[PDB]
Amino acid sequence: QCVKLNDGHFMPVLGFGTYAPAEVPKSKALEATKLAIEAGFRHIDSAHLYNNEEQVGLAIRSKIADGSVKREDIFYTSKLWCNSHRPELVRPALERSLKNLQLDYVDLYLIHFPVSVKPGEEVIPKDENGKILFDTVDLCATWEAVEKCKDAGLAKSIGVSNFNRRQLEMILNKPGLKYKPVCNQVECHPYFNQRKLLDFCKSKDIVLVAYSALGSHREEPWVDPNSPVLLEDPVLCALAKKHKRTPALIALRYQLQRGVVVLAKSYNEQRIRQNVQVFEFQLTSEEMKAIDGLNRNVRYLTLDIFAGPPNYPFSDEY
Numbered sequence: 001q002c003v004k005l006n007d008g009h010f011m012p013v014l015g016f017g018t019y020a021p022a023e024v025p026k027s028k029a030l031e032a033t034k035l036a037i038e039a040g041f042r043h044i045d046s047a048h049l050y051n052n053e054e055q056v057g058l059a060i061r062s063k064i065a066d067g068s069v070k071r072e073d074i075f076y077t078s079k080l081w082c083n084s085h086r087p088e089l090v091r092p093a094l095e096r097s098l099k100n101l102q103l104d105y106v107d108l109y110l111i112h113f114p115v116s117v118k119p120g121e122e123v124i125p126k127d128e129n130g131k132i133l134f135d136t137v138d139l140c141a142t143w144e145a146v147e148k149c150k151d152a153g154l155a156k157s158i159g160v161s162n163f164n165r166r167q168l169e170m171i172l173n174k175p176g177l178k179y180k181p182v183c184n185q186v187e188c189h190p191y192f193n194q195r196k197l198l199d200f201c202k203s204k205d206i207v208l209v210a211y212s213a214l215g216s217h218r219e220e221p222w223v224d225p226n227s228p229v230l231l232e233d234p235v236l237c238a239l240a241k242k243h244k245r246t247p248a249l250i251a252l253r254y255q256l257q258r259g260v261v262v263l264a265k266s267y268n269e270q271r272i273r274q275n276v277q278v279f280e281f282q283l284t285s286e287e288m289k290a291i292d293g294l295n296r297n298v299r300y301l302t303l304d305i306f307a308g309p310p311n312y313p314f315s316d317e318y
């Protein structure tokens with residue numbers, strides 16, 4: 001149920017997504033994460049950006065309090081947001097997440113997105129024309145500061161998110177590198193299966209962690225409603241009928257069988273319980289190949305909001 005990371009720690013291969021659209025009230029993240037843990041999730045994904053770490057930590061700590069799990073059974077990821085890329089601000093951001101969580105360490109701390117914005121409590125600062133107030137930070141300098149968080153024991157493992165290949169080689173080839181990224185958390189699903197980036201990550205012992213593995217929240221204005229609905233896919237639905245599963249389950253199983261660690265968000269008790277059944281069955285080689293054909297280079301989360309600056313990850317081929 002776990003993949004060994006390039007730093008020797010273990011990451012459960014199914015992870016619970018906690019991000020939800022802003023309209024969802026904060027209290028739902030607490031109850032959803034508790035259900036997820038009860039249902040069998042041990043890997044929990046959050047971030048400063050999500051504004052739920054107080055609730056997600058309470059949920060985690062509640063299931064420790066009631067004897068469900070031990071701290072060491074839980075793999076909790078946080079992420080450094082773009083307003084704290086500056087080296088001096090990286091540890092303060094990690095310590096703020098920890099005080100919010102009331103946890104002593106995160107199992108994994110990621111650079112969330114490689115484009116920096118102006119420091120300040122505003123996660124998306126903007127000028128009067130509505131344009132983003134970008135910042136100028138050496139991402140290698142950011143990484144050195146993330147590394148010291150591992151030195152200090154505040155983050156068991158460290159990694160990146162939304163990095164392309166050239167950005168991974170920039171970390172990888174940096175002089176004096178102490179710690180490789182253990183993972184690169186990116187959008188990945190049968191409509192955007194990241195085959196090329198996945199093959200690169202493997203080459204460097206970097207785990208690819210798939211987000212929007214189920215086709216994403218589809219929340220406007222982040223995703224176009226005219227994009228195809230992954231979970232309405234004819235092939236996924238046929239494999240669902242054949243296996244007596246669901247299309248979400250097919251989508252999730254596909255990643256596990258190609259060596260991708262897979263996130264899955266849901267605030268619904270029924271589907272939270274359904275999704276941990278990804279371990280109960282398996283796809284054949286021919287079904288895997290059919291799902292491979294579904295690729296349409298369809299990115300749900302383009303994050304145009306942050307395009308323009310060079311660090312914008314999604315302009316390269318991969």
Ligand SMILES: NC(=O)c1ccc[n+]([C@@H]2O[C@H](COP(=O)([O-])OP(=O)(O)OC[C@H]3O[C@@H](n4cnc5c(N)ncnc54)[C@H](OP(=O)(O)O)[C@@H]3O)[C@@H](O)[C@H]2O)c1
Binds near residue numbers: 211216231
């Ligand atoms: N840049 C980043 O690092 C980044 C970006 C995006 C996401 N993420 C992270 O990774 C997670 C990925 O999820 P996501 O939020 O993009 O969405 P997702 O996991 O791809 O899909 C979530 C959506 O699918 C629905 N769903 C869940 N289980 C289902 C099931 N069994 N059957 C049918 N529908 C189901 C959910 O509705 P219900 O809640 O009603 O079930 C919700 O509308 C996020 O929560 C977040 O932790 C990271």
Ligand SMILES: Cc1ccc(Cl)c(Nc2ccccc2C(=O)O)c1Cl
Binds near residue numbers: 112222306
């Ligand atoms: C503005 C901006 C820029 C980059 C990312 Cl990664 C995000 N993050 C998300 C955007 C939409 C939905 C979910 C997220 C997420 O990171 O989970 C945002 Cl809000």
